[PDB]
Design a protein around this ligand. Structure first.
Ligand code: QNB
Ligand code: BGC
Ligand code: CL
Ligand code: CL
Length: 438
C-alpha cells in the first residue's frame, strides 16, 4: 500500500546480496588457483544458478507480489517461469552429481579418485544444465501451443499444466522428492562406509606427511606432496623439471594442496598397476582386502615395489591369512627398525584389517564440511514449499497466499546463503572474498 518503499528496499537489498555474493564466488574461483578444484567447479555451477535467481527470479517475483498482478505480458512470463524451473532443476541435479561423486570417492578409494578430472566435471555440469533445460523449457513455453489454448490470463503468471493440483504434486515428487530420497540413500551408504573415517590418503599423509614445497628425502632425493619422488640431481631445477612435467605448469617449486592430491592419486593408480604387473606382488594383492591392500600400497610407496618384493616370506604369510605371524615376521626386518612408528601402523593394519592404527584428522574435510551445509540449507529451505504442495493436494484453502509467498522466498534465499556457507565452511573462500572487496 503506502509501505511499498520498505518492501522494495528489503527485497532489493536481498537480491543485491545474492548477486554480489555469487559473482564474488565465481570470481573467487576464477582468480585464485588454490580454489580451482572439481568440487569448486560444482560450486561454480551452483553459483551461476543462484546468481540468475538473484537477478531474475527474486526481482520479478517481488514485482508480481507487490503490484498484485503481472504487468509484463505472457511471453516474458513464460521465459521467467522456464528460467526459474530450469535453473532450480539444474541446482538439484548438481546436488545429485555431488552426491554421486562422494559415493564413488568413498566406495572406490583406489580406482575412482584418479579419474576425477576437470573434463569429466565440465561434462557432467554440461549434461545437468542441458538435461534440465530440455525437461522444463519446452514443456513450460510450448504447452499452450500443444493443447492449443492458453489458460493463463494477462495479469497472472503460472505454469499452465500445473492448473491441476495432482499434476503439480506428481511433478514435485519426480523433480524434488525422489532426488532427495536418492541423495538420502547413497549418503546413508557413505555414512556406513565412513563411520571410522580413514582412507589411503589420510594414511599416507600421516606416514609420509604432506608438504607443498620441495623437501629433500632422508635418502637425499627430491620429493613433493605426499612422498612423491622427483629426481636424484643436486640441482633443484632438475627436480623443478620433473615437477612442472607432472603439474603441466611452471610451479617455480611450489604446488597447491589440490595438485598434491591429484599427483597422489596418480601415484596410487600407478602403484596398483605396477603391483599387478609384478609377479611377486600380484598374488598377495589379489587376496587382500581394501584396507590391507592400502597397507601394501603404503609399503610400495616407501621402499618401492622391488623392496616390498623382498618380503616374499611375510607376503606368503599374508596370503595364508595368518595375520599375527605375518606381523611377527615383518618386525624382523630392518625396515621396522629404521622407521618404527610408520612400520608399526602398517603392520598393525595388516594384523587387524582395519584403520584402527590411525588417528582421524580431528578436522573434517572442507569438501564434506561444505557439502553438509549445502544439503541442510537446500532441504530446510525447499521442504516448506514442497510440503506446501503436498498439503495443497487435499486442501487448497488450508494454505493462504501469504504462506505461499513465504515458501517462495525461502527457496529463493537459499541461493543467498550458499556463498555464506562457502565462506564459513572454507577459510580460503572467505579470505578470497575479503581480498576481492579490495
Ligand atoms: O521446489 C520446487 O519449486 C520451487 C523452485 N523454484 C520455482 C518454484 C518453487 C520456488 C522456487 C520444486 O520441487 C517443484 C515445485 C512445484 C512443482 C514441482 C516441483 C522443483 C521445481 C523444479 C526443479 C526442482 C524442484
Ligand atoms: O607406486 C607408487 C609410486 O609411484 C610413483 O609414480 C611415485 O613417483 C612415487 O612417489 C610413488 O610412491
Ligand atoms: Cl584435469
Ligand atoms: Cl582441507
Amino acid at each position: 500500500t503506502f509501505e511499498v518503499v520498505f518492501i522494495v528496499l528489503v527485497a532489493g537489498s536481498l537480491s543485491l546480496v545474492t548477486i554480489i555474493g555469487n559473482i564474488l564466488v565465481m570470481v573467487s574461483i576464477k582468480v585464485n588457483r588454490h580454489l580451482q578444484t572439481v568440487n569448486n567447479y560444482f560450486l561454480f555451477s551452483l553459483a551461476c544458478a543462484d546468481l540468475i535467481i538473484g537477478v531474475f527470479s527474486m526481482n520479478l517475483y517481488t514485482l508480481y507480489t507487490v503490484i498484485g498482478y503481472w504487468p509484463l505480458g505472457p511471453v516474458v512470463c513464460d521465459l521467467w517461469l522456464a528460467l526459474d524451473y530450469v535453473v532450480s532443476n539444474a541446482s538439484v541435479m548438481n546436488l545429485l552429481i555431488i552426491s554421486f561423486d562422494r559415493y564413488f570417492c568413498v566406495t572406490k578409494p583406489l580406482t575412482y579418485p584418479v579419474k576425477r578430472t576437470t573434463k569429466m566435471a565440465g561434462m557432467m555440469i554440461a549434461a545437468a544444465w542441458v538435461l534440465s533445460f530440455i525437461l522444463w523449457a519446452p514443456a513450460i513455453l510450448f504447452w499452450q501451443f500443444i493443447v492449443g489454448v492458453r489458460t493463463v490470463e494477462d495479469g497472472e503468471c503460472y505454469i499452465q499444466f500445473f492448473s491441476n493440483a495432482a499434476v503439480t504434486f506428481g511433478t514435485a515428487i519426480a523433480a524434488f522428492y525422489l532426488p532427495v530420497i536418492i541423495m538420502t540413500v547413497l549418503y546413508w551408504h557413505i555414512s556406513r562406509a565412513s563411520k571410522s573415517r580413514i582412507n589411503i590418503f589420510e594414511m599416507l599423509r600421516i606416514d609420509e606427511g604432506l608438504r607443498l614445497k620441495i623437501y629433500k628425502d632422508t635418502e637425499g632425493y627430491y620429493t613433493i606432496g605426499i612422498g612423491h619422488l622427483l629426481t636424484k640431481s643436486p640441482s633443484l631445477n632438475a627436480a623443478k623439471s620433473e615437477l612442472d612435467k607432472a603439474i603441466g605448469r611452471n610451479t617455480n617449486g611450489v604446488i597447491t594442496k589440490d595438485e598434491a592430491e591429484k599427483l597422489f592419486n596418480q601415484d596410487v593408480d600407478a602403484a596398483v598397476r605396477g603391483i599387478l604387473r609384478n609377479a611377486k606382488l600380484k598374488p598377495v594383492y589379489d587376496s587382500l582386502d581394501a584396507v590391507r591392500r592400502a597397507a601394501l600400497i603404503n609399503m610400495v610407496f616407501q621402499m618401492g615395489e622391488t623392496g616390498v618384493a623382498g618380503f616374499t616370506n611375510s607376503l606368503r604369510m599374508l596370503q595364508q591369512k595368518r595375520w599375527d605371524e605375518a606381523a611377527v615376521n615383518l618386525a624382523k626386518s630392518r625396515w621396522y627398525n629404521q622407521t618404527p612408528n610408520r612400520a608399526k601402523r602398517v603392520i598393525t593394519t595388516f594384523r587387524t584389517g582395519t584403520w584402527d592404527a590411525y588417528p582421524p584428522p580431528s578436522r573434517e574435510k572442507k569438501v564434506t564440511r561444505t557439502i553438509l551445509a549445502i544439503l541442510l540449507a537446500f532441504i530446510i529451505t525447499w521442504a516448506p514449499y514442497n510440503v506446501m504442495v503436498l498439503i495443497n493436494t487435499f486442501c487448497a484453502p488450508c494454505i493462504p497466499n501469504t504462506v505461499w509467498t513465504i515458501g517462495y522466498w525461502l527457496c529463493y534465499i537459499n541461493s543467498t546463503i550458499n556463498p555464506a556457507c562457502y565462506a564459513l565452511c572454507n577459510a580460503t573462500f572467505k579470505k578470497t572474498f575479503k581480498h576481492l572487496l579490495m
